[PDB]
Design a protein around this ligand. Structure first.
Ligand SMILES: *C(=O)[C@H]([C@@H](C)O)[C@H]1CC(SCCNC=N)=C(C(=O)O)N1
Length: 239
């Protein structure tokens, strides 16, 4: 419940960021840089959540389709394989979502993103990269509401599409608890911005949504977004 101690894990991991908690439309802030919570950032791979929903709902793909790897080299060897939407989500495989995005196309993408009102709701002109280098931007409080709605099936999509994307996002399962969430890491902008947006599904059915945002640098291990989040949810006794 403090708020000062959570400042000190942020203090020591020599980062700058904010953890936004939403418990039934009540927003709390934690970190060492609470001002981040209202500044716009590129969403990075957290936009895969809304990309999937738009693609599924408009029947540009489905949860069974297998995306074929056509042999070109990709940033990670784990990405060099055939995979579904959901497997691409768990690995944040940009090429699959770029292909998806190109099927949706610019008009449909822009119309949906502003109908959802996602962040600043601007995708510019290149349909396959606006979530990594602009011009699409989003504050971390806006991300905790988005994933909050998704968790309660309240987004302006059908419920079956939402439920489909939610099963793509299961991260841990321990003690009757479930953690869902999506990581992001914009490595190609300065300063780098890391994301971990999701929700906790407590055994009694309660839902607490979070959006960890932090400045990033090339040397940190990717698990730093998980470490900081997990021990903050334990400190706040959400888990
Ligand atoms: C999403 O935010 C980025 C995007 C900018 O490429 C990618 C890069 C990193 S690391 C890839 C993890 N691979 C696999 N098993 C992530 C991320 O997972 O946070 N997403």
């Amino acid at each position: 419940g403090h708020n000062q101690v959570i400042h000190q894990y942020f203090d020591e991991k020599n980062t700058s960021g904010v953890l936004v908690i939403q418990t039934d439309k009540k927003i709390n802030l934690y970190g060492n840089a609470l001002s981040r919570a209202n500044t716009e950032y590129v969403p990075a791979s957290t936009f895969k959540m809304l990309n999937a929903l738009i693609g599924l709902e408009n029947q540009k793909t489905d949860i069974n389709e297998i995306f074929k790897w056509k042999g070109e080299k990709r940033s990670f060897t784990a990405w060099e394989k055939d995979m579904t939407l959901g497997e691409a989500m768990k690995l944040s495989a940009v090429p699959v979502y770029q292909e998806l995005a190109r099927r949706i196309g610019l008009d449909l993408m822009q119309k949906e993103v502003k109908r959802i009102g996602f962040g600043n709701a601007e995708i510019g002109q290149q349909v396959d990269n606006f979530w990594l280098v602009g011009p699409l931007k989003v504050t971390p409080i806006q991300e905790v509401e988005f994933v909050s709605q998704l968790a309660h099936t309240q987004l302006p999509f059908s419920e079956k599409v939402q439920a489909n994307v939610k099963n793509m996002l299961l991260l841990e399962e321990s003690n009757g608890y479930k953690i869902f969430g999506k990581t992001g890491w914009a490595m190609d902008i300065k300063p780098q911005v890391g994301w971990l947006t999701g929700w906790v599904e407590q055994p009694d059915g309660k839902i607490v949504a979070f959006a960890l945002n932090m400045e990033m640098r090339s040397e940190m291990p990717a698990s730093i977004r998980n470490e900081l989040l997990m021990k903050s949810l334990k400190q706040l006794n959400i888990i």
